[PDB]
Design a protein around this nucleic acid. Structure first.
Lengths: 293, 193, 478, 204, 204, 204, 184
RNA sequence: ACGAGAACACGUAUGCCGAAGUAUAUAAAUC
């Protein structure tokens, strides 16, 4: 049940719909994509990690502090402006022990980077030929302070996690974002076991908080939504090397729960096929990683 | 499967002007206010020069991936940053990091002149850089490195940035180290100058 | 003339003798306001409905105490609705103008009630509602009259639907405590995401207009389906619609049916980026009145069930049908980026192309018409098309939507930080009624939609200046 | 695709005042010594060589020039783009000269004092002008691109004409009143990139 | 287009005291010898040739002067475009004088002691003036631009008038007490740039 | 606008001590022969011709002079600009005098021994002084500018009077005891620049 | 400002030896014929005139004399300016004496031979109209005293007494009447 | 099998044109 720490040193581009967009964090599906591509690139076996690994979302950290997504459990004006809650207060959050002034101070302290729209041009056009207009475009980047970054949670047996160690060691030289081949998004990592992370991960309760993006299988959906509080977010995009035309290849739309979901009845997930008229399957990750409180 | 890292430094011989903000405003970081050279700049200038020299080589090394055939990039160029040696030396000698140049323009038929300002990174500074190469085909590394050497030569005898026909941008490359960072491929014999 | 119309007509104008008494016209300013209004309206030939005269003559206590009316006659229900709602030459000029308009312009037949409503609005939107020395009157006469109508129609739906005919004995406190009527709320999500789905700066007003127009269309439709009028709509805008209906089984069934149809249509037109949620909490005659501060409680409960409905906005069948495969590979909308809809040659889907064309027309033309076939999509296989002024009157001769233009008499037309404390509390004591939130919503809407345009008529530094000006004006506001 | 390099020495004959500050002279701020900006040289050559060939009133208005001049310096604005071929870099104070001046203790900068006599009143007003010392040297570098094989000889003939004209003219200001005369010496031509021989070429 | 060269020697008749640094003289600092700046020559010739033609009080007010004067010395200041047509260079202490003065042990500078007598007081005040020595020589070069093919003769006539007038006047400072009288010798005319004739041209 | 020349010889009859090197005599450093500085002549003439006209004590305190003196000589000190109209150059040994003293083996300087005898003690104190040999001839030139066509006659009458008073006086120092008496000879007038009629003017 | 002139001749009877050499006699090296320094006559007339009037020992220490000597002869070293009003010029021979000596073949040096004539020319400036008479009568007295005293060095054994003759008082510059004056 | 992937904030223009380190002043006064 190890955790992984990542520091970047260079701005990163994650984005939501367009290149003008800048986003702080990415999803378990993007990282499953990265790991799968790197395994196929290294020439190893994907069988072991297709159906033995459970991954969580990316999360921010600061100097000696950790954050987790807001669970969907009087002021009703300050909490709505909050996205992440510190670990030390996580239990205190679920018992109603957090006050408005404390929350406001939290909002004050939570600056972990900034945003920037870098403008560029393209002269590969008939500018090579003759008079032709230039094409200014814009990329969006996020930049970290020297002591902030990302962390992940992974669990299973020792063998699978040794494989994961090797994969991260290889991966730390490629990137985790958009314009990777343009100079964005490299990192260095460390393997950590914090005590309080293990304490939260090993609770005992009646509800469950989701730390990933997952979808229920057919035969269980009717029993999954008995008493639930969730968010559906459409996830679409383009593929990397399915067929001839990139434009003619675009993933079929998918809907999945978000990362603050609370479920009274657990479900196992599945790795879902979102391919059609392609040569090889295109997988979306959907398998939940719970914390039971 | 192996990954190779080429590291070194670039020195500014005559004043440099990238100026993404403008055109005086030179690109920096918005917090530390230190000049940098974006990797898109280097990638584009090298692409233009090497294409002018000559195709499948530019396509295998920089990647096209929409022309009806899909080729994935094989060389990754990162941003460049001010080095510690230069910061220490400049802080001791009490030198600013950036210059401001005043220029003028003359009207034909009217002989009236009007001014300009161009902000420009100082002479003698240094930047640190790293490139990554992903060895996807064993029988091609010598060819790819010949081509990358030619590109660095051409960029050495040319300019980076804007206003180079009037005297800006000239750079040099020093202190190269070529280490194999993932895998077991022998890259203790390569050279890039 | 259906009796519903009789109550409604005797309801809007039941409090006009007050103006004819404030105007100082010596002809009809000597007696009590009810008989002054009756004497005024006893002139015009169109308004000669007898039961309407009966309704308007006795909207108070003693008048009914000495009138020994029949058991079925709307003066009693007028009294009850009036009570629940309650909780200098310019007037003379106004009543001259009123006489002219009443004898010349308006019609009295069925379906003229919306026109009468706009007429009363355009005339009375500033008349002081009352000059009571012991009360703070932050309301206009328009709000008193209109909310009296809404309450009257709801009380009648309740009383009639349960098969009571002895209105007098039933309504002449004990009834005031019964769970009589019902508060209903529509909230549409995803406005921020849909408003910023453009690729430049002035183009993000056309789709703002589209959202606003859809909200108004759906609410007007809802009122039509329930045999009341646009009287019963308290507030609209943002993404909200606060409405008032009756507490009976029939309206509940119809609300459920309408909800199913809307959910189906919103899913059909748009996958999930735009939803609609409806929640209803029952209220008594006491709840809207200020008795034990329960109005805050009612509002909080409606918001709570709204949040819950937002949390579980789909079912298993819907989510399985959503994850069913469909054709792709074709290009997506160049501005809207969605690949489930057939596209035209220009590269824009139906709705986005319609919006750009309607904005181009709106820059010149300024009337919108709701037809069976036309240009831009609406609920229940309806369309909106663009037309000009004279075209509008010719179409009226043979529903119309405008932009802040108080044109009256042309058929049926509909003229289109600390917010939580204002919307939920208003005035906590001695003024905590539905009327106060009505007037507060009207004043805020006038500030937001009309005063903002006047301020921007003369318009990085500008953004900061506007922010400072808005902050100062809001500080002056409260 | 080939690139040809030209290097040599600029020698100051009479005092020189590039004076781009506004009365100071332009300085590098890592060494605090004078420099000769390259845009000065390009602009002066543009003007001189343009006036050599026909310069028309209509050609005076639009800042367009003869086809040859546009070819060698670039137009790239007329709706018919023209990429330049001759890149002019700056020139810096030489190390030989700084050694010599430090040894013989010669200050690098003169401050000439000047006066003006107005008419009707004959009251004089004075002023100060800084200027580089004579005997100084600077090191200059040019790069020329072979975009076409058959135009090289003509292009270098035209550059030779520009050199002659500039050597009988002035750089900087106050040229009619004395300042700013230069010479070029110790040149060298080399094909730094490509496979185009440059042995028969010369710039005097 | 053509540029024509004039060259010659200036001969010092009585003491010369430019004093550009001021009671010292103006000196180079690569060699530490006197020079004659071009500014003073230009200004003095201009003042003579303007006074000889008309000088109006309103024209005295703002340095507005005759048309030929502005054609040959340049104004381009009143919205009319006119850059100078004569380029005047500095005068450097000549070599033959150096050889002669070295091998006869004669210095390059006299130091004259001067006295002032006060009115009604008869007290003397002493002063020291540092004059360039008699018998010296200097070398000068002028460049003429040919901007118009039908004015060369007229402009040269005006130039010889200015030279003659200056041979009957003084260059420098304090010439009303015996300083600055000069002469011109060994004048040669060459066309440096173009295909123009200079066999009929002369300046005395 | 024109310029007249006045030339001639100054003949010294008695001792001439000028001592500008001061007890030696001021001397050219290129020929090693005496001169009369033009400053001396201008000052002596100014003082004589200025004492003749009105010389007020209040004017003496403020160093103001008579209008004739300033127009002929120029002060430009009281805020009113007056440029000198008479230019005086130095003097030098004439060729005939050099030939005569060379043929006759006669030197150019006399050493006079003077004895001071003091009151109440009678101690003889000796002194040596250098003088210019009597009978030598100097060549002088004045330049006269015309700024007004009229006042030439009055100006020349005044310069006549000035020459007269100087000829009845001494030049240099040591005058009230036997040195300085000179006269003028061989005066000539020749118009050297311009188109003026000055053939009836007469300097005696 | 008028320049009056005095001129005259001086006759030599006792073989004169001035002592301008500091045993030779001072000569202008143009003619190799004897001269007389003007400081000689100036100082000797000065001393005689000073002796005639009162001479104080304290003034002897400080080289101060009577106002008449400080005006006519003039010193201008005490901080009060006194520019001299009597320019004495050096005296030469007369051509009459030269012709007579050449005809009779007589040398000039033995000492200054007897029978010489000397042409002395004084220039007197009129800085004040009134004091002219007083100044000229004083000059007449000084001339008489000189005529009855000795000029030269070491003349106390019989040498250095000489005579005055043949004057001419002509105004050379000015418009002042100078007919009533006399210097015998 | 990462809202992906190809994409030099480029291009034409300088330090300008005009301007006297000048104007007055005896190396002089006593033996």
């Amino acid at each position: 049940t190890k955790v992984f720490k990542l520091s970047f040193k260079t701005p990163v581009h994650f984005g939501k719909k367009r290149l003008s967009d800048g986003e702080m964090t990415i999803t378990a599906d993007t990282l499953f994509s990265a790991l799968f591509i790197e395994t196929l690139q290294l020439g190893k076996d994907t069988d072991w990690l297709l159906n033995d690994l459970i991954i969580s979302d990316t999360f921010p950290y600061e100097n000696e502090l950790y954050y987790l997504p807001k669970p969907l459990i009087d002021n009703h004006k300050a909490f709505k402006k909050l996205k992440y809650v510190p670990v030390h207060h996580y239990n205190q959050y679920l018992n109603g022990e957090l006050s408005a002034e404390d929350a406001t101070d939290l909002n004050d302290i939570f600056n972990i980077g900034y945003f920037s729209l870098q403008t560029k041009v393209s002269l590969i056009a008939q500018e090579t030929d003759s008079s032709a207009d230039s094409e200014p475009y814009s990329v969006g980047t996020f930049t970290f302070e020297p002591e902030a970054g990302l962390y992940f949670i992974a669990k299973g047996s020792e063998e699978t996690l040794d494989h994961l160690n090797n994969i991260m060691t290889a991966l730390q030289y490629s990137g985790l974002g958009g314009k990777r081949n343009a100079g964005y998004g490299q990192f260095e990592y460390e393997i950590i076991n914090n005590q309080q992370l293990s304490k939260l991960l090993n609770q005992n309760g009646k509800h469950s908080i989701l730390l990933s993006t997952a979808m229920a299988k057919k035969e269980e959906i009717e029993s999954a939504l008995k008493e639930a509080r969730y968010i559906l977010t459409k996830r679409s995009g383009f593929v990397q090397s399915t067929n001839y035309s990139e434009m003619l290849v675009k993933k079929s739309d998918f809907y999945s729960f978000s990362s603050g979901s609370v479920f009274k009845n657990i479900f196992n997930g599945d790795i879902f096929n979102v391919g059609h008229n392609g040569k090889h399957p295109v997988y979306r990750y959907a398998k939940p990683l719970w914390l039971e409180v | 499967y192996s990954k190779i890292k080429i590291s070194g430094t670039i020195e500014v011989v005559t004043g440099l002007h990238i100026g993404g903000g403008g055109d005086s405003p030179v690109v920096r970081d918005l917090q530390t206010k230190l000049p940098i050279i974006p990797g898109s700049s280097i990638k584009g200038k090298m692409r233009n020069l090497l294409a002018k020299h000559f195709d499948e080589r530019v396509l295998r090394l920089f990647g096209s991936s929409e022309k009806g055939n899909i080729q994935r990039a094989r060389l990754q160029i990162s941003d460049a940053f001010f080095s510690e040696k230069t910061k220490e030396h400049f802080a001791q000698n009490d030198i600013a990091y950036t210059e401001t140049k005043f220029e003028n323009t003359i009207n034909r038929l009217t002989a009236v002149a009007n001014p300009r300002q161009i902000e420009r990174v100082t002479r003698g500074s240094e930047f640190d850089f790293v490139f990554i190469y992903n060895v996807d085909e064993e029988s091609q590394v010598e060819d790819d490195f010949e081509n990358i050497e030619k590109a660095i030569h051409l960029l050495e005898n040319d300019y980076l940035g804007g206003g180079g026909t009037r005297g800006n941008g000239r750079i040099q490359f020093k202190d190269t180290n070529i280490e194999t960072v993932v895998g077991e491929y022998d890259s203790t014999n390569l050279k890039i100058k | 003339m259906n009796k519903k119309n009789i109550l409604m007509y005797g309801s809007l104008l039941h409090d006009i003798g007050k103006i004819i008494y404030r105007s100082g016209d010596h002809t009809f300013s000597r007696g009590t306001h009810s008989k002054l209004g009756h004497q005024f309206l006893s002139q015009f030939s169109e308004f000669k409905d007898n039961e309407v005269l009966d309704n308007v003559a006795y909207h108070h206590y003693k008048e009914l105490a000495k009138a020994n009316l029949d058991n079925d006659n709307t003066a009693y229900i007028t009294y009850i609705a009036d009570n629940i709602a309650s909780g200098s030459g310019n007037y003379t000029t106004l009543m001259k103008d009123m006489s002219h308009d009443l004898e010349h312009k308006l019609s009295i037949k069925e379906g003229t009630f919306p026109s009468l409503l706009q007429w009363t609005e355009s005339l009375w939107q500033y008349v002081p509602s009352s000059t009571n020395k012991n009360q703070l009157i932050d309301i206009s006469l328009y709000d008193h009259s209109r909310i009296t109508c809404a309450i009257a129609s709801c009380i009648f739906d309740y009383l009639n639907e349960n098969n009571i005919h002895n209105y007098k004995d039933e309504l002449f406190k004990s009834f005031y405590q019964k769970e009589a009527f019902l508060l209903l709320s529509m909230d549409m999500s995803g406005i921020q995401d849909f408003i910023y789905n453009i690729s430049a700066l002035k183009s993000l007003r056309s789709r703002s207009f589209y959202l606003e127009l859809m909200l108004e269309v759906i609410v007007d439709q809802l009122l039509e389906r329930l045999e009341l009028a646009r009287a019963n709509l308290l507030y609209t805008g943002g993404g909200h619609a606060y409405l008032l209906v009756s507490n009976t089984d029939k309206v509940k069934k119809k609300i459920t049916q309408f909800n199913n149809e809307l959910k189906k249509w919103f899913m059909s037109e748009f996958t999930t980026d735009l939803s609609l949620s409806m929640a209803f909490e029952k209220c008594s005659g006491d709840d809207l009145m200020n008795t034990s501060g329960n109005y805050r409680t009612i509002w909080r409960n409606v918001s709570s069930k709204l949040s819950d409905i937002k949390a579980h906005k789909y079912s298993a069948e819907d989510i399985l049908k959503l994850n069913h495969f469909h054709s792709y590979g074709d290009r997506e909308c160049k501005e809207c980026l969605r690949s489930d809809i057939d596209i035209n040659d220009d590269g824009l889907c139906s709705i986005c192309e319609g919006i750009i064309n309607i904005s181009n027309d709106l820059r010149d033309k300024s009337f919108f018409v709701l037809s069976e076939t036309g240009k831009l999509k609406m609920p229940f296989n309806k369309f909106i098309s663009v037309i000009d002024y004279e075209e509008a009157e010719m179409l009226v001769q043979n529903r119309i939507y405008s932009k802040n233009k108080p044109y009256i008499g042309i058929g049926i037309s509909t003229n289109l930080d600390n917010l939580g404390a204002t919307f939920i509390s208003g005035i906590p004591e001695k003024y905590n009624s539905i009327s106060r939130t009505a007037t507060l919503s009207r004043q805020l809407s006038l500030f937001f939609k009309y005063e903002l345009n006047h301020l921007l008529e003369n318009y990085w530094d500008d953004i900061i200046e506007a922010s400072i000006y808005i902050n100062d004006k809001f500080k002056e506001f409260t």
